Amino acid sequence: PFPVRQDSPLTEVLPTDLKTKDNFVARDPDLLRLTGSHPFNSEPPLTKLYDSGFLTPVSLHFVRNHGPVPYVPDENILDWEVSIEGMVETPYKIKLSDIMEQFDIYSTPVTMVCAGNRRKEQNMVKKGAGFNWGAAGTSTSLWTGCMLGDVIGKARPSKRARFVWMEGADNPANGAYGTCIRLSWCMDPERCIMIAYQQNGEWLHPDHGKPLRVVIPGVIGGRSVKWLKKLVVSDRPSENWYHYFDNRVLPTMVTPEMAKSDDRWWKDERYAIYDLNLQTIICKPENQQVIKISEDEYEIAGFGYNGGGVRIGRIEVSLDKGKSWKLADIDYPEDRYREAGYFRLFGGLVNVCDRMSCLCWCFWKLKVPLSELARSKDILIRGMDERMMVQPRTMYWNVTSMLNNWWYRVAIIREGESLRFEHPVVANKPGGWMDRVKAEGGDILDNNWGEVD
Amino acid sequence: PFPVRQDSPLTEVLPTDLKTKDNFVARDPDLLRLTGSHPFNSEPPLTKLYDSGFLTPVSLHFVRNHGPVPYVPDENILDWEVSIEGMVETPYKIKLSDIMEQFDIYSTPVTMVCAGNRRKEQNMVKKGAGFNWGAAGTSTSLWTGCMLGDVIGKARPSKRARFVWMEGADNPANGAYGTCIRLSWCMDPERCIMIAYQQNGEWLHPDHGKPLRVVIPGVIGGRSVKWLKKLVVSDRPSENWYHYFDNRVLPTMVTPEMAKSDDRWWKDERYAIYDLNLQTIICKPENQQVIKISEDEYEIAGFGYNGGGVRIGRIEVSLDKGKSWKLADIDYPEDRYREAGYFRLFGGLVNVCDRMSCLCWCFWKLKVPLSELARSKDILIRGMDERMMVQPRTMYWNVTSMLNNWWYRVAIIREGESLRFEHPVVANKPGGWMDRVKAEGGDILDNNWGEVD
Ligand code: MTV
Numbered sequence: 082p083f084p085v086r087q088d089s090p091l092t093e094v095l096p097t098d099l100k101t102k103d104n105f106v107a108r109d110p111d112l113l114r115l116t117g118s119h120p121f122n123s124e125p126p127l128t129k130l131y132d133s134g135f136l137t138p139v140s141l142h143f144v145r146n147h148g149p150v151p152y153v154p155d156e157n158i159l160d161w162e163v164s165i166e167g168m169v170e171t172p173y174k175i176k177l178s179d180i181m182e183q184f185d186i187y188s189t190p191v192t193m194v195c196a197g198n199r200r201k202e203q204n205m206v207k208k209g210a211g212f213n214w215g216a217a218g219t220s221t222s223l224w225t226g227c228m229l230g231d232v233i234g235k236a237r238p239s240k241r242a243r244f245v246w247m248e249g250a251d252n253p254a255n256g257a258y259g260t261c262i263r264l265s266w267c268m269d270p271e272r273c274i275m276i277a278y279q280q281n282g283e284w285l286h287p288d289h290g291k292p293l294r295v296v297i298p299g300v301i302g303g304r305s306v307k308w309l310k311k312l313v314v315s316d317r318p319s320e321n322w323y324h325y326f327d328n329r330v331l332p333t334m335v336t337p338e339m340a341k342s343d344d345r346w347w348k349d350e351r352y353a354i355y356d357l358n359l360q361t362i363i364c365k366p367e368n369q370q371v372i373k374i375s376e377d378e379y380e381i382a383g384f385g386y387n388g389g390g391v392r393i394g395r396i397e398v399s400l401d402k403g404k405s406w407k408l409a410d411i412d413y414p415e416d417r418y419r420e421a422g423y424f425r426l427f428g429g430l431v432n433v434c435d436r437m438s439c440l441c442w443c444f445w446k447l448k449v450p451l452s453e454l455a456r457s458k459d460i461l462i463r464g465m466d467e468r469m470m471v472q473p474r475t476m477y478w479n480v481t482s483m484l485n486n487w488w489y490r491v492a493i494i495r496e497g498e499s500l501r502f503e504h505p506v507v508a509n510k511p512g513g514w515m516d517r518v519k520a521e522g523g524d525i526l527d528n529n530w531g532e533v534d
Numbered sequence: 535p536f537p538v539r540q541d542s543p544l545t546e547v548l549p550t551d552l553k554t555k556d557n558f559v560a561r562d563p564d565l566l567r568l569t570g571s572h573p574f575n576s577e578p579p580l581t582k583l584y585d586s587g588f589l590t591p592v593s594l595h596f597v598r599n600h601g602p603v604p605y606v607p608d609e610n611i612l613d614w615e616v617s618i619e620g621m622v623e624t625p626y627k628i629k630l631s632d633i634m635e636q637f638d639i640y641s642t643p644v645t646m647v648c649a650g651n652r653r654k655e656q657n658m659v660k661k662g663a664g665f666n667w668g669a670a671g672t673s674t675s676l677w678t679g680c681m682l683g684d685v686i687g688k689a690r691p692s693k694r695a696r697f698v699w700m701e702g703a704d705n706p707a708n709g710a711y712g713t714c715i716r717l718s719w720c721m722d723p724e725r726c727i728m729i730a731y732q733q734n735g736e737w738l739h740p741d742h743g744k745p746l747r748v749v750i751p752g753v754i755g756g757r758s759v760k761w762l763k764k765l766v767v768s769d770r771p772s773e774n775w776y777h778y779f780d781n782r783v784l785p786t787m788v789t790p791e792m793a794k795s796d797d798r799w800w801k802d803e804r805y806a807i808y809d810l811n812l813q814t815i816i817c818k819p820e821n822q823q824v825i826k827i828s829e830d831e832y833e834i835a836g837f838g839y840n841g842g843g844v845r846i847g848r849i850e851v852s853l854d855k856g857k858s859w860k861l862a863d864i865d866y867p868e869d870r871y872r873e874a875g876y877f878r879l880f881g882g883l884v885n886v887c888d889r890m891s892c893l894c895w896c897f898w899k900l901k902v903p904l905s906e907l908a909r910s911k912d913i914l915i916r917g918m919d920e921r922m923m924v925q926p927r928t929m930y931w932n933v934t935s936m937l938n939n940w941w942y943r944v945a946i947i948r949e950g951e952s953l954r955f956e957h958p959v960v961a962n963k964p965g966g967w968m969d970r971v972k973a974e975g976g977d978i979l980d981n982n983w984g985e986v987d
């Protein structure tokens with residue numbers, strides 16, 4: 082009735098991982114390494130992400146590890162303990178077995194996305210402090226677990242409390258990875274924030290937080306803390322190093338030099354990222370794909386996602402550099418779950434039907450004549466949400482190069498009787514229109530995306 | 535400790551109103567008529583809106599009446615009845631006196647804004663179906679009343695219910711003005727949706743819904759139904775004519791001719807406006823203001839507002855056509871109320887302190903050297919919210935020309951030793967850079983805002 086998937090979890094640790102601190106972690110070879118062999122930060126290839134459909138296989142899900150994966154022995158897992166302390170009436174410590182036994186379990190489709198997705202495009206303009214991501218720093222899954230809200234609810238947060246700090250078990254360079262989320266979001270059924278212990282029917286792979294993680298829909302991955310150990314109800318935001326010095330969109334005029342040499346650019350919550358911005362990405366045609374000109378339709382296609390559970394109302398494609406726009410047909414598989422009423426899946430209640438929010442990505446398609454693309458220099462795509470907030474033409478360059486959501490552009494190159502298509506960049510190799518434009522010497526932030534007229 | 539204001543309510547009915555169906559309505563002469571003498575749709579002049587500060591005087595508050603104001607005798611007011619029916623357990627009818635006596639009362643600062651604000655700018659490009667608004671289709675007030683949520687709560691909405699229809703007592707051309715809002719927004723303390731019977735300490739003026747109206751913060755005025763009579767809890771959106779055929783941002787490529795000749799462009803909720811988009815507006819320098827060049831700072835200034843209670847994180851000004859940007863200093867008087875804890879005002883609880891949302895506009899300032907403006911063709915301004923959603927460069931032209939939130943541009947005209955400044959348009963007269971550009975024959979949607987280089 083709606084998408085469901087569980088695959089075989091991988092066994093083979095790859096030679097590259099055998100040589101590394103994560104020597105016990107079986108990882109899909111198709112994932113594209115972005116900080117070398119370790120720590121593991123990866124995205125699937127864009128075509129495999131799209132071709133997988135609404136649900137990304139666990140093994141192709143993107144990984145973002147700031148440091149090494151903490152070793153977790155399966156024969157002890159159920160006793161994995163999490164601490165609920167802070168501005169509560171009744172602090173307590175709960176183990177996973179007791180999470181499972183005492184709280185209502187749900188299973189829920191959730192798009193995850195990294196703050197960094199589409200970062201390389203920023204890097205091509207001006208190299209910042211972050212490693213390249215392509216456009217596939219997103220993956221969608223079914224997550225099974227309880228509601229953070231219920232766990233936190235049980236300790237009786239005080240009236241002055243505003244934030245739930247989360248802290249993991251891992252040990253990145255600057256210590257335990259930790260950040261926070263707002264308390265009332267935890268309490269809001271529409272946001273549906275979980276403590277998850279399964280993903281696409283399987284107990285968590287180590288890269289995805291085994292045994293236990295927070296998953297915060299409509300919010301950057303950065304706030305979905307893996308290998309969860311502490312939850313601290315508080316009146317103010319986290320003071321973890323990783324809350325301050327990562328996952329912020331600093332004002333465009335702030336330079337890497339200014340941010341290195343002034344701590345307090347990082348100490349204003351106004352630049353701290355929670356809810357994602359609206360992104361739309363073109364997947365068909367693919368990077369470097371060639372197609373013979375004819376009188377036929379080609380189905381341009383992609384996906385889009387948004388923040389705060391706000392639905393994307395329209396996706397629009399221009400072949401004339403944004404002078405005119407064509408309305409794409411959007412598909413929202415989350416509505417399949419919504420339409421379907423209550424189900425039990427992987428031992429959890431499927432209750433999207435209780436909500437109106439869009440916690441997941443969606444897919445769009447638009448057929449145009451190959452002959453219309455023949456007369457075009459590019460495909461552009463943008464989305465607008467139900468707040469009538471649209472993606473910008475202009476790039477918002479920022480130090481961490483996060484949340485880069487300016488219109489995604491695929492260049493159309495005429496070659497005799499065919500067309501070749503270039504995406505902006507490939508995640509870990511050259512091969513995009515941006516690579517070309519750098520060789521030509523174009524200013525990518527000019528009004529023609531750095532190209533010649 | 536925070537802004538408070540109550541003024542004398544006006545008595546004098548103006549000659550123009552004496553001649554009209556609204557012959558009993560005392561109206562401020564400084565307001566600018568936008569559909570002639572009647573129905574009354576007006577905005578204050580931009581400088582008076584800004585100069586009034588955080589709280590707009592009631593008399594200068596903007597009015598949007600689709601038709602005539604229903605006559606309400608003060609000596610009966612308390613018995614004004616409202617009907618709570620629909621998918622509830624216990625339908626009931628409550629009169630105002632009993633609203634006041636039985637529900638908790640609150641007093642709350644709320645920015646209102648019309649869907650149509652900044653519409654003329656769209657009209658200058660291509661004339662649509664809506665009457666010109668300038669940039670002052672917004673006003674901020676203290677509103678006193680109960681929570682829609684509590685009223686609706688008392689009837690016990692059913693589990694399948696998703697929407698609260700609202701219907702007024704007035705009789706526009708197509709009958710009772712009605713629309714809706716989502717039920718869970720009604721239940722959400724952060725949204726803080728009221729049934730208000732006072733405004734800046736005074737019982738409601740007739741233009742603002744006397745005796746009773748809904749006020750929905752962070753949402754377009756259109757959903758804040760005046761002269762309230764029915765509330766209908768329902769599983770699906772309103773079917774009022776005014777819900778369908780007003781207050782929608784139809785896809786840009788949809789023409790007035792296509793929308794006239796196809797009903798169903800208006801029957802997709804995805805284009806129905808609720809939460810406002812992010813707007814920033816420049817108020818200083820004013821329209822046509824002249825200033826002598828010197829080595830002095832000038833304080834560029836304005837306001838901004840956003841939807842869904844999402845704070846505006848940054849306001850940025852460019853003097854170089856958006857190549858570089860300067861960070862403005864934002865002031866948020868709503869935080870004054872937040873910081874201040876619990877108070878009683880006009881018989882209502884001031885409890886912004888309970889919330890983290892921004893339901894109100896904010897003010898920004900930026901000092902630049904007059905000599906830097908001297909070398910510029912324009913001031914541009916944009917904002918970005920805490921969802922890292924920024925206003926667009928590009929205009930989103932649409933049939934009703936609503937929610938036009940592309941960067942607001944003030945042209946700088948060099949005249950010997952002074953500078954003259956032109957805002958895009960004046961609400962009800964010529965006098966802007968857009969008027970000039972139309973006389974020159976410029977394409978306002980081109981990359982130089984229709985101007986010559
Ligand atoms: N404990 C912990 N350590 C991390 O380094 C860590 N990184 C995260 C980021 S930062 Mo980003 O907004 O820079 S995307 C993202 C993800 C991704 O989870 P995945 O690896 O399961 O896809 O989990 C977040 N949770 C974390 N939790």
Ligand code: MTV
Nearest residue numbers: 597598600648649702711742755756758759760
């Ligand atoms: N009963 C009723 N009739 C209206 O014509 C009507 N118009 C509204 C609109 S449509 Mo717009 O998004 O086209 S701004 C706006 C306002 C403005 O209220 P004000 O006149 O008190 O400022 O109230 C809304 N509520 C209404 N209520």
